Structures are given as structure tokens and as C-alpha cells.
């Protein structure tokens, strides 16, 4: 029987990153700068705040007032339009512009030793000490009580264990800050929910929920009848996914990746393969990432992008020469170019690192006769890359905007047939979406890079066609987890994503061929520590 649970006392805050790297929850702790917010205006966190702190459910008040009376050993509490209490520090209250006060449809309280009621109303309550809030809540009709802080207010409320939940906005950008939110003891509080990732006012943010740790139903039976035929399949335990299965709302788009790992681990088919390692496999998944709101670089481990950007630039040049990448210490294709690998593909007459008519060649020269990686292929075969950029510019409603790497004629001449079969483009209202069909998906190692590659490419094609990127849609055919990744992915699934980074391109690049490694910036990448998947 606890005071926070009786009077439904919650903290709501927005924390940015702080100018001074290992990341943790404490990375997000910036509250204020010189008695104001560290940031200009984040209009989406403003709207979330207003909606959370003003929302009330009438039909739920009976149970709340009952509990409050029952616990105070009273039979009654004492307009009749139910509202929330909002508590502020003095410095916080005096931060707020005058006409923005008092906060609308909320009972405004102000912790202060040096204000006094008789220069405000009794609409706008005041209290000298913390215990004077519990007293005032005891005498009030209110839905819930929200601590809107000040670093001081939050500090004393958390250490006195008077907070049931923290509504915590992660502002994923760095500002000058002089006051910080206190370090949330992850023994005292734990995250039970994570929102979608959003862009507002040139930053990404998400909304998480910390919870104090515990140290017609005619149609409800019809649901049970429809499940009468429903079915550990693979030797995977519950305790394994404790944090993953503890979350209620898992709306962060990184869960589209994590949920597929979970599904293959729980329900996947045990299969041998080419590699001789064994996999769990399933067939047919879709993920969708909103490139207008974030860059979906996985945050539950560290990912590097230089190599995958160089690979894409090498595709766009129409190159097949593995040495070009090796000379820049990009080793993605090294194992596919060895004497031994090519001899096993029966490419006995192929030079080492001559990968044959792979992506680059099919994108710029589909149907040209491959000779060797040094030949001049200029104006030979179909320049599909040019054709799709022309169709996007000149016939945006075409349903034929496809870039295909799967050249059936040339497959046996490639060091290996492409995993990334095709990209299809869709244009609507100045916006570009991309579907990539992937025949073979290594969920542990390859798929995180593959999402980054095709997200970057969707931004590159958008910018050179004067469009804004919309959705990257990733279609997985044979989707597999290598048995040697299972322990590593167990670790990864029990990590809570961070708000995603943003991709910035040099805005001066207007032709697909003009991009260089320096034209790409990842911003505000906050990530858990690197995992070796093997």
C-alpha cells in the first residue's frame, strides 16, 4: 500500500544529450539551460506533454477516489469536471511565460518555500514541503498527478520513492545544459514501453515509459473458440528473453527486425545448408522503415557504414573489380574472390577478385558480354540505373521502375548470384519509396547492413530526382538465423533500442554518379556496445 500507487504520482520529462563514446539511458539527461529549455521548440514533445498531462478517464475515477478514501479512512474526498494535478518547482513555474499560466485544464500546484497563496488564487495551489502535496491530493478530486519537474523537484520525488512511472521523452540531439535529470536506478525503475521514432524540429526523438519495479465479452469467448486449433519447438527458453518479453508496447521500428529474429528462434525450421553450420529458417517477411522520420541503423549493437557506402559507390560505377574495395580495406567481397572460392564455383579461368557480372555490371550493362573486370563496357548493355532515374524524373507513376541484378543468363559467371534480387520504386506527392526483394537473408550479420545499404540508396535516388524519401520496404524470402548467432542474438533481443540516427547527404550532389565517401554523414547515432555474432 504505497503513496505513489494511491495518489497515482508520475514524472513526465524530456531529456536531450549534453555537450562534453559509451551510451546508456543516462546519455539522455539534459533538462535545462539558464532557467529555460536547452532547445528552441520541439513541437511533437509539446503535443505529447499536453496530451498526457491533460488526458482523463471519467469512468475510471470511481476506483481511484475509492482507493484514496479507503486508504485515508474517510468515506468522501471532502465544478465536478475531472482533471489532473501538475506539480512544478518555483524556478520551473517562473520559467513559463505568464499567458501560458496557469496550465489549462490542469490543477496547477507549485512547490516553493518563498511563494505564498495570497498573491495567486486557491485555483493555483502552493505547498512549502513535499508531504504538503500528499495532504492536498487527499482533499482533491483529480485523475492523476504529474511532476513536471525542475531537476530539484524530480531528484527529491525519486529518492523519496513517490513516482510510480516516468514518461521520459528521449530528444536525440546535444545541447548546452546546466541542469540534468537524475540517474534512474535500473534496480528501482525499468522501461516497460518504447514508442515509434519521430522527427520534429530537426531532431529524432522517442517516448519511453519507466515503471517502478515490484521488489461485450460475448465476443471475448468467441475469440477463444476461434483459437481451438492453436499450437518449445526449438530448444529456446523463456528466461532467455526476459527483458524482450517484459515490454508491453514495442513500437520502436527496430522491433520489426528483433521480432523477426524472435519469430525464427521460436518457430523457425531447423535446416542444413551450403555453409554446413545449420540455420533456423522461415520464408516471407516484410519490414517497412519511414525514412522521413529516421535512418534505421540498428541501435541494439554497433554498426559501421564506410564499407557499405564504398560498396554502393562501386556498384554505381558499375565495377566488378574486388581489388578496388580491398585497396580501401573494404573486405565484404574478399572471401568471394579467392582462387579457392572461384575454383569451387568452376570459374577456373577467372582472375582472383574478378567477381564477374555481379550488381555493378547488371545495373550499368545488363545483357553485355562479360570478358574481364578491366574491359571497357562503355555504352554496352542496358544502363538500368540511368533508365530508372529517367523514369522517376519523367514518368513517376510508372509501375515499371525496377532495377534487377538477377540476370539468369549470367548467374553461373558471377562469384555468387545476388542476394538483393531487385529494387522497385514508387513516387507519390514528391516522395520516393523503394521495395528491395532479398532471396537470402542472414538475419544476424547481413540484414542489419542490408537495411542501411538500401536506405542510403533510397536517399541517393530521392536527392538526385528532387524527391523526398518516404518508405524503404524490405521483403525477405529465405530468412535464416545461423546456429552460431543464437547466443549473440539472445543478448541483442534483451537490449532496448535508442532513438535512431539521421542520414545527411551533401545537398550539392545532383547526379547519382557524383557521390563520394565524404558526401555522407550519420548524425546522433546512439547505440549499444558491439556484438561479435559468432
Ligand X SMILES: NC(=O)C1=CN([C@@H]2O[C@H](COP(=O)(O)OP(=O)(O)OC[C@H]3O[C@@H](n4cnc5c(N)ncnc54)[C@H](OP(=O)(O)O)[C@@H]3O)[C@@H](O)[C@H]2O)C=CC1
Ligand Y SMILES: O=c1ccn([C@H]2C[C@H](O)[C@@H](COP(=O)(O)O)O2)c(=O)[nH]1
315 binds a copy of itself (CB under 8 A): no
Options 27, 173, 440, 502; binder of a copy of itself; rule CB under 8 A: 440
What is the distance, to the nearest Å, from the Cα of residue 6 to the centroid of all Cα atoms in its chain?
34
14 binds ligand DQF (CB under 6 A): yes
Closest CA to 416 of 508, 344, 479: 344
95 binds ligand DQF (CB under 6 A): yes
- DSSP characters for 109-134? EEB-SS--GGGS-SSS--BSSSHHHH
Q: Is there a binding annotation on residue 91?
A: yes
Q: Is there a binding annotation on residue 124?
A: no
Complex with ligand DQF: residue 13 or 107, whichever CB lies closer: 13
Q: Which stretch binds a copy of itself (CB under 8 A): 66-74, 343-351, 407-415, 504-512?
A: 407-415
Q: What are phi and psi of 165, to 5 degrees?
A: -140, 145
Q: Which stretch binds a copy of itself (CB under 8 A): 146-154, 343-351, 395-403, 451-459?
A: 395-403
| b (16+ CB within 10 A) / e for 20-52 | eeebebebbbbbbbeeebbbeebeebeebbeeb
229 binds a copy of itself (CB under 8 A): yes
Residues 110-169 within binding reach of ligand DQF (CB under 6 A): 148-149, 169
204 binds ligand Y (CB under 6 A): no
CA distance 303 to 285: 22
Options 69, 141, 156, 259; binder of ligand X; rule CB under 6 A: 156
* Residue 210: its H or E element: strand 203-212
CA distance 420 to 530: 25
Give strand pairing partners of 50. Answer: none
Is 419 among the catalytic positions?
yes
CA distance 6 to 10: 11
Distances (CA, A) of 453 to 312, 351, 447, 450, 513: 7, 27, 10, 5, 16
CA distance 39 to 16: 8
450 binds ligand Y (CB under 6 A): yes
Binds 450: which of a copy of itself, ligand X, ligand Y, none (CB < 5-8 Å by kind): ligand Y
Number of H helices, E strands in the chain: 16, 19
Residue 68, classed as helix, strand or coil, is helix
As a dihedral over the C-alpha atoms of residue 146, residue 149, residue 154, residue 158, rounded to 10 degrees, the angle is: 0
424 binds a copy of itself (CB under 8 A): yes
Give strand pairing partners of 127. Answer: 111
Q: Which stretch binds a copy of itself (CB under 8 A): 154-162, 334-342, 430-438, 525-533?
A: 430-438
Residues 171-210: x/- map of binding to a copy of itself (CB under 8 A)?
---------------------xx-xx-x--------x-x-
Residues 95-124 within binding reach of ligand X (CB under 6 A): 95, 111-115
274 binds ligand Y (CB under 6 A): yes
Of 15, 419, 434, 441, catalytic? 419
Binds 190: which of ligand DQF, ligand Y, a copy of itself, none (CB < 5-8 Å by kind): none
As a dihedral over the C-alpha atoms of residue 362, residue 367, residue 368, residue 374, rounded to 10 degrees, the angle is: 20
Residues 62-91 within binding reach of ligand DQF (CB under 6 A): 88
Complex with ligand X: residue 23 or 175, whichever CB lies closer: 175
Q: What are phi and psi of 92, to 5 degrees?
A: -60, -55
Complex with ligand Y: residue 125 or 341, whichever CB lies closer: 341
Binds 46: which of ligand DQF, a copy of itself, ligand Y, none (CB < 5-8 Å by kind): ligand DQF
Options 81, 230, 346, 399; binder of ligand Y; rule CB under 6 A: 399
Q: Which residue is nearest to ligand Y (CB)?
A: 446
Options 416, 421, 522, 531; binder of ligand Y; rule CB under 6 A: 416
Catalog residues that contact ligand DQF under the rule CB under 6 A.
Answer: 12-14, 36-37, 45-46, 49, 88, 92, 95-97, 100, 148-149, 169
Q: Which residue ranges make up the annotated binding site for NADP(+)?
A: 14, 31, 35-36, 90-92, 112-114, 150-153, 156
Q: Which residues are catalytic?
A: 419
Amino acid at each position: 500500500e504505497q503513496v505513489c500507487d494511491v495518489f497515482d504520482i508520475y514524472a513526465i520529462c524530456a531529456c536531450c544529450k549534453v555537450e562534453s563514446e559509451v551510451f546508456n539511458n543516462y546519455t539522455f539527461r539534459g533538462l535545462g539551460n539558464k532557467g529555460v529549455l536547452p532547445w528552441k521548440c520541439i513541437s511533437l514533445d509539446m503535443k505529447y506533454f499536453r496530451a498526457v498531462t491533460t488526458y482523463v478517464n471519467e469512468s475510471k475515477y470511481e476506483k481511484l477516489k475509492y482507493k484514496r478514501c479507503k486508504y485515508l479512512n474517510k468515506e468522501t474526498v471532502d465544478s465536478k469536471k475531472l482533471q489532473n494535478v501538475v506539480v512544478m518547482g518555483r524556478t520551473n513555474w517562473e520559467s513559463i511565460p505568464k499567458k501560458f499560466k496557469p496550465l489549462s485544464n490542469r490543477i496547477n500546484v507549485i512547490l516553493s518555500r518563498t511563494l505564498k497563496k495570497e498573491d495567486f488564487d486557491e485555483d493555483v495551489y502552493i505547498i512549502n514541503k513535499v508531504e504538503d502535496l500528499i495532504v492536498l491530493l487527499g482533499k482533491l478530486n483529480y485523475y492523476k498527478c504529474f511532476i513536471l519537474g525542475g531537476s530539484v523537484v524530480y531528484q527529491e520525488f525519486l529518492e523519496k520513492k513517490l513516482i510510480k512511472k516516468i514518461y521520459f521523452t528521449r530528444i536525440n540531439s546535444t545541447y548546452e545544459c546546466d541542469v540534468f535529470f537524475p540517474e534512474i536506478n535500473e534496480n528501482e525503475y525499468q522501461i516497460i514501453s518504447v514508442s515509434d521514432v519521430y522527427t520534429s524540429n530537426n531532431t529524432t526523438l522517442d517516448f519511453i515509459i519507466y515503471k517502478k519495479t515490484n521488489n461485450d465479452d460475448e465476443e471475448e469467448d468467441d475469440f477463444v473458440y476461434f483459437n481451438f486449433n492453436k499450437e518449445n519447438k526449438n530448444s529456446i527458453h523463456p528466461n532467455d528473453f526476459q527483458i524482450y518479453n517484459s515490454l508491453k508496447y514495442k513500437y520502436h521500428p527496430e522491433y520489426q527486425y528483433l521480432n523477426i529474429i524472435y519469430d525464427i528462434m521460436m518457430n523457425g525450421n531447423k535446416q542444413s545448408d551450403r555453409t554446413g553450420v545449420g540455420v533456423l529458417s522461415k520464408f516471407g517477411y516484410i519490414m517497412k522503415f519511414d525514412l522521413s522520420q529516421y535512418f534505421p541503423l540498428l541501435t541494439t549493437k554497433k554498426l559501421f557504414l564506410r564499407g557499405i557506402i564504398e560498396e554502393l559507390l562501386w556498384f554505381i560505377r558499375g565495377e566488378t573489380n574486388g581489388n578496388t574495395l580491398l585497396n580501401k580495406n573494404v573486405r565484404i567481397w574478399e572471401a568471394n574472390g579467392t582462387r579457392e572460392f572461384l575454383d569451387n564455383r568452376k570459374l577456373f579461368h577467372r582472375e582472383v577478385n574478378d567477381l564477374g557480372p555481379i550488381y555493378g555490371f547488371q545495373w550499368r550493362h545488363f545483357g553485355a558480354e562479360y570478358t574481364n573486370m578491366y574491359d571497357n563496357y562503355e555504352n554496352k548493355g542496358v544502363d538500368q540505373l540511368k533508365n530508372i532515374i529517367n523514369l522517376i524524373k519523367n514518368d513517376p507513376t510508372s509501375r515499371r521502375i525496377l532495377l534487377c541484378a538477377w540476370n539468369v543468363k549470367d548467374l553461373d559467371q558471377m562469384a555468387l548470384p545476388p542476394c538483393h534480387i531487385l529494387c522497385q520504386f514508387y513516387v507519390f506527392d514528391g516522395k520516393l519509396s523503394c521495395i528491395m526483394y532479398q532471396r537470402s537473408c542472414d538475419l544476424g550479420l547481413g540484414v542489419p547492413f542490408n537495411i542501411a545499404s538500401y536506405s542510403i540508396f533510397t536517399h541517393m535516388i530521392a536527392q538526385v530526382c528532387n524527391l523526398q524519401p518516404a518508405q524503404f520496404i524490405h521483403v525477405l524470402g529465405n530468412a535464416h538465423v545461423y546456429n552460431n548467432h543464437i547466443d549473440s542474438l539472445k543478448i541483442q533481443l534483451n537490449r532496448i533500442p535508442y532513438p535512431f540516427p539521421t542520414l545527411k547527404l551533401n545537398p550539392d550532389i545532383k547526379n547519382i554518379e557524383d557521390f563520394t565517401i565524404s558526401d555522407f554523414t550519420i548524425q546522433n547515432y546512439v547505440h549499444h556496445e558491439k556484438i561479435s555474432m559468432d
